[PDB]
Amino acid sequence: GSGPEEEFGMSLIKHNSCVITTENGKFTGLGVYDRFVVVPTHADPGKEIQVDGITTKVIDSYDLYNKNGIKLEITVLKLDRNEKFRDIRRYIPNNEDDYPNCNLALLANQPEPTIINVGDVVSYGNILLSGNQTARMLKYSYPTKSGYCGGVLYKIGQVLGIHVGGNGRDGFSAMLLRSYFT
Ligand SMILES: *[C@@H](O)[C@@H]1CCC(=O)N2CCC[C@@H]2C(=O)NC[C@H](NC(=O)c2cc(C)on2)C(=O)N[C@@H](Cc2ccc(F)cc2)C(=O)N1
Numbered sequence: 001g002s003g004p005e006e007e008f009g010m011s012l013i014k015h016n017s018c019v020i021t022t023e024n025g026k027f028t029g030l031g032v033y034d035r036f037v038v039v040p041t042h043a044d045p046g047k048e049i050q051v052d053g054i055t056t057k058v059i060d061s062y063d064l065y066n067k068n069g070i071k072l073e074i075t076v077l078k079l080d081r082n083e084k085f086r087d088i089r090r091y092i093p094n095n096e097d098d099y100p101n102c103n104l105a106l107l108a109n110q111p112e113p114t115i116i117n118v119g120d121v122v123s124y125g126n127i128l129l130s131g132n133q134t135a136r137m138l139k140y141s142y143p144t145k146s147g148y149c150g151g152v153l154y155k156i157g158q159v160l161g162i163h164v165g166g167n168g169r170d171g172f173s174a175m176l177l178r179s180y181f182t
Helices: 004-016
Strands: 017-022 025-033 036-040 048-051 054-065 071-079 099-106 114-129 132-140 152-155 158-166 171-175
Touching (some): 004 017, 004 099, 004 152, 017 036, 025 158, 036 158, 048 071, 071 158, 071 171, 099 158, 114 158, 114 171, 132 158
Parallel strands (some): 071 132
Antiparallel strands (some): 017 048, 025 036, 036 071, 048 054, 054 071, 099 114, 099 152, 132 171
16 A cells, blocks of 8 residues: 555554553554543553653543443543644544454554554454453454554544454454544
8 A cells, every 4th residue: 555545544643643651561542632642441551651752641531431331442541732633533433333444553663654454344342352351342354463552443534443452363443433532
């Protein structure tokens, strides 16, 4: 890819991603709008994080759950920083769905911003990730790696999820739904 799907992803990286550092390492963070970022819950962000190496206070944070209290592996952070993110909420789906031909946009743990074609994505339900029940997963068949967490699953004009785990054959993202942010 050097065409539109790659190009949309690179723009998404440049305008709406950052590297979030916690005590658990470096994660790709998705800036949703203004000072709101999402990161995988297992990043366990505290009261201070780094955003692109800059120590930043977390004004508030909260984890998301499904209807039965199962973690979604999404954590929302409101950051104490001057910069505002471009609002990408209109690109986030309203509903769960399957999606053909998706890409993953990676920033953290890569030598340079990286776009990967993960192929077709299905809404997979609940899984066990490192032994923990996790809900509203999107599954793709791609050999993801340890440094991919927080990577943004997308298609042109559609911001679909954030990468939270895998087993070497399959990769999983937490679904982004517009109602989480509105
Ligand atoms: C990013 O922090 C990381 C992404 C890891 C990844 O994509 N990997 C591909 C193969 C090597 C790693 C890996 O270490 N996977 C282990 C585990 N995977 C599973 O449990 C699993 C279940 C099914 C079904 O398919 N894979 C995993 O990915 N763990 C997470 C960390 C995590 C997530 C949620 C929690 F509640 C606790 C811990 C992970 O390592 N993610």
